[PDB]
C-alpha cells in the first residue's frame, strides 16, 4: 500500500506510456516507448509484455495494473547501456535528459538534476552501474 506521493510519482511514469492520455496503455503505445529506447519488440512480444500485467484481460494496462507490476544481472546491464550512451560507465544528467526527451518529456536542467540526485549514492553527481543496480533492487 503506497503513499499519495508515490502514487502521484507513478502516475507521472504511467503518463510517459499513455501517449493519447486516455488512461490506457496500448501495445502500440508500449511499442512507441520501446523504440524510443532503442528496442524493437515484435507485435507478439508487446502483447506478451502487456499480458503479464493485465488484470481484466482487456488488452491494455490501466493505472492499477501499472502499479502492481512495479512490485537478472544481464537485464540490468542491458538497461544501463540504454542510458549510458557513451559507455563511460556513468549516467550523466545530459544522458538522462536525452533519454527523457526522446520519451517525449522535456525536463528542465533542475528536474534532470533532481532525478540523478535521487539515484546518486556517492554524490559525484552521476549514476554508476552499482547505483543503478541499487535503484532497481
Amino acid at each position: 500500500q503506497l503513499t499519495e506521493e508515490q502514487i502521484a510519482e507513478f502516475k507521472e511514469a504511467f503518463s510517459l506510456f499513455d501517449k493519447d492520455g486516455d488512461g490506457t496503455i496500448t501495445t502500440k503505445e508500449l511499442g512507441t516507448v520501446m523504440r524510443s529506447l532503442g528496442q524493437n519488440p515484435t507485435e507478439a512480444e508487446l502483447q506478451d509484455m502487456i499480458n503479464e500485467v493485465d488484470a481484466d484481460g482487456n488488452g491494455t494496462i490501466d493505472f492499477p495494473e501499472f502499479l502492481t507490476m512495479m512490485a537478472s544481472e544481464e537485464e540490468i546491464r542491458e538497461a544501463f547501456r540504454v542510458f549510458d550512451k557513451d559507455g563511460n560507465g556513468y549516467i550523466s544528467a545530459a544522458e538522462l535528459r536525452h533519454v527523457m526527451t526522446n520519451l517525449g518529456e522535456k525536463l528542465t536542467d533542475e528536474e534532470v538534476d533532481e532525478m540523478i540526485r535521487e539515484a546518486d549514492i556517492d554524490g559525484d553527481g552521476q549514476v554508476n552501474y552499482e547505483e543503478f543496480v541499487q535503484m532497481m533492487t
Binding site: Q6, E9, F10, E12, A13, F14, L16, F17, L30, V33, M34, L37, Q39, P41, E45, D48, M49, E52, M69, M70, S72, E74, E75, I76, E78, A79, V82, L96, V99, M100, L103, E105, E111, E114, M115, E118, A119, F132, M135, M136
Partner: peptide
Amino acid sequence: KKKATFRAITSTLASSFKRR
C-alpha cells in the same frame, strides 16, 4: 520524484530483455 520514472523505464526494459 522521478525515481519512479527512472525505475519504470528500467523495469520496462528489463521486461523486454526477459523474453529474448
